[PDB]
Ligand binder design. Structure first.
Ligand SMILES: CCCCCCCC/C=C\CCCCCCCC(=O)OC[C@H](COP(=O)(O)OCC[N+](C)(C)C)OC(=O)CCCCCCC/C=C\CCCCCCCC
Ligand SMILES: [Ca+2]
Ligand SMILES: [Ca+2]
Ligand SMILES: [K+]
Length: 830
């Protein structure tokens, strides 16, 4: 059950029922009076009922549009769980219910002296019932009904829109927190950058003298997974079969990888089989072709695996050593089979992260030579390792080596992967392949959007800290000259920090490189310590316990279904930009709720000001009960509902993330409610008071007469030349009514955005609201001009002259908010 539904939606229904009851009591009592057997006696109950029918029709169509949105999305627990927002809306509704109740009792109490008035027949009871019908009808009107159905729509409206932007939400209460997101922690590879990495640069050993180590760098072209491209040396097109060093490197590439290149004929472009990393080497082999096999004549469907198949028989893989996270490399054992190359012994190819394959290296091959890995051969090639991955391109270096004297196959463990590393201690060295994946377009811009939004991004990659930082500088996470030695840590560094110092690091960090699986859950632990709403991404099962600890666990479309199920939202895009585009939508929905609430509260305040003002001033009452019901049906109805179709605001990603601690209504916003409320409630009684004092063929009276109108029968000398029954005239009541309905249709236009002016976001930015306004307006004109109708609601037709007065009075309500929305943008926001 819902506390808001119980105290507002249901309470409003009982009020209508007891209102109708009050009507039918007046019906029975209007029999014992004389001349009251007229055919007007049934009219009032017949209207309160007839309006209740239309108010119900609105309810049905408002519920039918809500259940459809939820179902259209779905198509294509000991009762103790509620969102902080749901706890606030239920606290709100309880206050509104209580406040309106006191307010309406006060309406009935301030009219005690008006009970025995001659207008009621001179009976105290007959008047005491009337003002009861007033207070109750006001209570029905004042109540902001329809909230849950409008939210339910918006909640599913954005969800359909998020799915359009590849953002697939697991749960619905999740999207509320998406807008409150403070920190977005995301994996670099696959998300912040596409998985289309190819080998663009590569270098090997050229000439070696003590402290004179020379390198032979190469630059390959064609960063697509295709043999399209030629290897270049010093910007000079040279065949790969011109250097003996490329021979050894190409050999390891095609033998250590388990990646194929199935050219899909229907695609037209070469595709990828296996892993993205290893696939690049396969494309590298074809683009090099040191064997100088016939290339062009081989068809598109086989060329990709052509030069790759030349080595499939040159040697043959015996067994392949698996990858281990500790060693950070992998190896194959290849005794030359079917090639008569077994006479020249057998070798062992390895492939992995530089440092591991260099520290555990003792020899450096020079084309077809062997040299003991000394000092200069190490530091003067690892300088290139650094300057490659730290430059403009930010390459992912991958050292390639070979073991000329491998341990016997008669001695090898397989159940223990930690032993694998010990089989790779002594080996030669060939070269290193520079490899890059490109960051997605405008991630740098999507990073920017977060910064403006006050949302912090934290990168979690597997690169070294040097290139990890270089990546952040490329995508604007870090400044090009900012000292980031305080905002970037590694697995070894973060663990070497004091426990209390570690959480302090998470208050400033934006990058993490070479990270243990346990750190992700350990970072969320620290981010939650600073009370930050954390959106964490993941792909592996190592991320699984972290996607439950984080506020918004974010999975991957290409990721395993284990994380996709145990998350709150899944990226079918595998894009980082999808994360923030879904954050934006989370904010857009909450704003749409605040526009809905603002319109109702502000307007309905005036409706309460209206009744209280005329009573406190001494003016003839502006509204009878059945008119108050018409105000509600027309303003609290379709126009307010269509407010849930407002477009996303403009100042949406510039304001800081909304805290769950923030009250539902701020101080300024409450004042803003009262101000607009204050005006419409005064502008409506000033409309009726205008008919009296200043209107043409509206009996011009002094303000003093109008205030003391009850003495008209007595004060003949003070009310000379006037008719006492003119204070019961329908024209002023029509002016008050027409203004109130118009000024609320104008106030609806104020709720297309919270702070953006109507100049920035025009009234036609929401067509559904325009139609709603048109409908309510035409419906009001129907009551005024279709002859049986004005008699019923005690109204008279308005001519063009006094319809313009309605405009002159109403339209400034747009003017007032524009004054306030100006102050909000320029004196509060920024
Ligand atoms: C016959 C009956 C009258 C009917 C009235 C209908 C109201 C019409 C609604 C809108 C008309 C706006 C046209 C004005 C042209 C300005 C263009 C526009 O684009 O405007 C943008 C600017 C502010 O924008 P900014 O933030 O970018 O510049 C701030 C940035 N910086 C500080 C660097 C400059 O102008 C703003 O929007 C300010 C807009 C305020 C204009 C209305 C104010 C008139 C005064 C009173 C009317 C209501 C009184 C009720 C009670 C009042 C009590 C106080
Ligand atoms: Ca209402
Ligand atoms: Ca209203
Ligand atoms: K979670």
């Amino acid at each position: 059950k819902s506390l808001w539904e119980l105290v507002i939606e249901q309470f409003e229904d009982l009020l209508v029922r007891i209102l109708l009851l009050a009507a039918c009591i007046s019906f029975v009592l209007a029999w014992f009076e004389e001349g009251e057997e007229t055919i007007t006696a049934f009219v009032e109950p017949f209207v309160i009922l007839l309006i209740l029918i239309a108010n119900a029709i609105v309810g049905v169509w408002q519920e039918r549009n809500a259940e459809n949105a939820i179902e259209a999305l779905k198509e294509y627990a000991t009762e103790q769980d509620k969102t902080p927002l749901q706890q606030k809306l239920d606290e709100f509704g309880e206050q509104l219910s209580k406040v309106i109740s006191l307010i309406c009792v006060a309406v009935w109490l301030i009219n005690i002296g008006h009970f025995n008035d001659p207008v009621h027949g001179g009976s105290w009871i007959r008047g005491a019932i009337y003002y009861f019908k007033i207070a109750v009808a006001l209570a029905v009107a004042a109540i902001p009904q329809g909230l849950p159905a409008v939210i339910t729509t918006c909640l599913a409206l954005g969800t359909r829109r998020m799915a359009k932007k590849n953002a697939i939400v697991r749960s619905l209460p999740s999207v509320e927190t998406l807008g409150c997101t403070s920190v977005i922690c995301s994996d670099k590879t696959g998300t912040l950058t596409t998985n289309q990495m190819s080998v663009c640069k590569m270098f090997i050993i050229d000439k070696v003298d003590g402290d004179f180590c020379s390198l032979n760098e190469f630059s390959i072209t064609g960063s697509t997974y295709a043999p399209e491209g030629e290897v270049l040396k010093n910007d000079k097109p040279i065949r790969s079969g011109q250097f003996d060093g490329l021979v050894e490197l190409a050999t390891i590439c095609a033998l250590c990888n388990d990646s194929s290149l199935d050219f899909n004929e229907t695609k037209g472009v070469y595709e990828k089989v296996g892993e993205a990393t290893e696939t690049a080497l396969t494309t590298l082999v074809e683009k090099m072709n040191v064997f100088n096999t016939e290339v062009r004549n081989l068809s598109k469907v086989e060329r990709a695996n052509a030069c790759n198949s030349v080595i499939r028989q040159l040697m043959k893989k015996e067994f392949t050593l698996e990858f281990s996270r500790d060693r950070k490399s992998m190896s194959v054992y290849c005794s030359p089979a079917k090639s008569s190359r077994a006479a020249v012994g057998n070798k062992m190819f390895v492939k992995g992260a530089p440092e591991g394959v260099i520290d555990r290296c003792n020899y450096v091959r020079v084309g077809t030579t062997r040299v003991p890995m000394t000092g200069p051969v190490k530091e003067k090639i690892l300088s290139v390792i650094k300057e490659w991955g730290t430059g403009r391109d930010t390459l992912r270096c991958l050292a390639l080596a070979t073991r000329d004297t491998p341990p016997k196959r008669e001695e090898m463990v397989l159940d223990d992967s930690s032993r694998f590393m010990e089989y790779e201690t002594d080996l030669t060295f060939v070269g290193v392949v520079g490899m890059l994946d490109p960051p997605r377009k405008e991630v740098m811009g999507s990073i920017q959007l977060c910064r403006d939004a006050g949302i912090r991004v934290i990168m979690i990659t597997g690169d070294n800290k040097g290139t990890a930082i270089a990546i952040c500088r490329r995508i604007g996470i870090f400044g090009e000259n900012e000292e980031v030695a305080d905002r970037a840590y590694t697995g070894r560094e973060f663990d070497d920090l004091p426990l209390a110092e570690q959480r302090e690091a998470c208050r400033r960090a934006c990058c993490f490189a070479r990270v243990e699986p346990s750190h992700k859950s350990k970072i969320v632990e620290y981010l939650q310590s600073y009370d930050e709403i954390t959106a964490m991404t993941g792909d592996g099962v190592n991320d699984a316990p972290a996607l439950k600890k984080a506020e918004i666990g974010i999975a991957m479309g290409s990721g395993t279904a284990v994380a996709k199920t145990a998350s709150e939202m899944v990226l079918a895009d595998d894009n980082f930009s999808t994360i923030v585009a879904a954050v934006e939508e989370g904010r857009a929905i909450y704003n749409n709720m605040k526009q809905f609430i603002r319109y109702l509260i502000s307007s309905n305040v005036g409706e309460v000001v209206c009744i209280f003002l005329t009573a406190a001033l001494g003016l003839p009452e502006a509204l009878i009960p059945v008119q108050l019901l018409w105000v509600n049906l027309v303003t609290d109805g379709l126009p307010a509902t269509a407010l849930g179709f407002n477009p996303p605001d403009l100042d949406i990603m510039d304001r800081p993330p909304r805290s769950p601690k923030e009250p539902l209504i701020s101080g300024w916003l409450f004042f803003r409610y009262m101000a607009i409320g204050g005006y419409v409630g005064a502008a409506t009684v000033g409309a009726a008071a205008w008919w009296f004092m200043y209107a043409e063929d509206g009996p011009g009276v002094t303000y003093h007469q109008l205030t003391h109108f009850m003495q008209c029968t007595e004060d003949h000398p003070h009310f000379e030349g006037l008719d006492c029954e003119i204070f019961e005239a329908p024209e002023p009541m029509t002016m008050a009514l027409s203004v109130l309905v118009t000024i609320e249709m104008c106030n609806a236009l104020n709720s297309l955005s919270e702070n953006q002016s109507l100049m920035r976001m025009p009234p036609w930015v929401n067509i559904w609201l325009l139609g709603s306004i048109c409908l309510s307006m035409s419906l009001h004109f129907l009551i005024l001009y279709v002859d049986p109708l004005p008699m019923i609601f005690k109204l008279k037709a308005l001519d063009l002259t006094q319809w313009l007065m309605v405009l002159k009075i109403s339209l400034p309500v747009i003017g007032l908010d524009e004054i306030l929305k100006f102050i909000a943008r320029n004196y509060l926001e920024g």
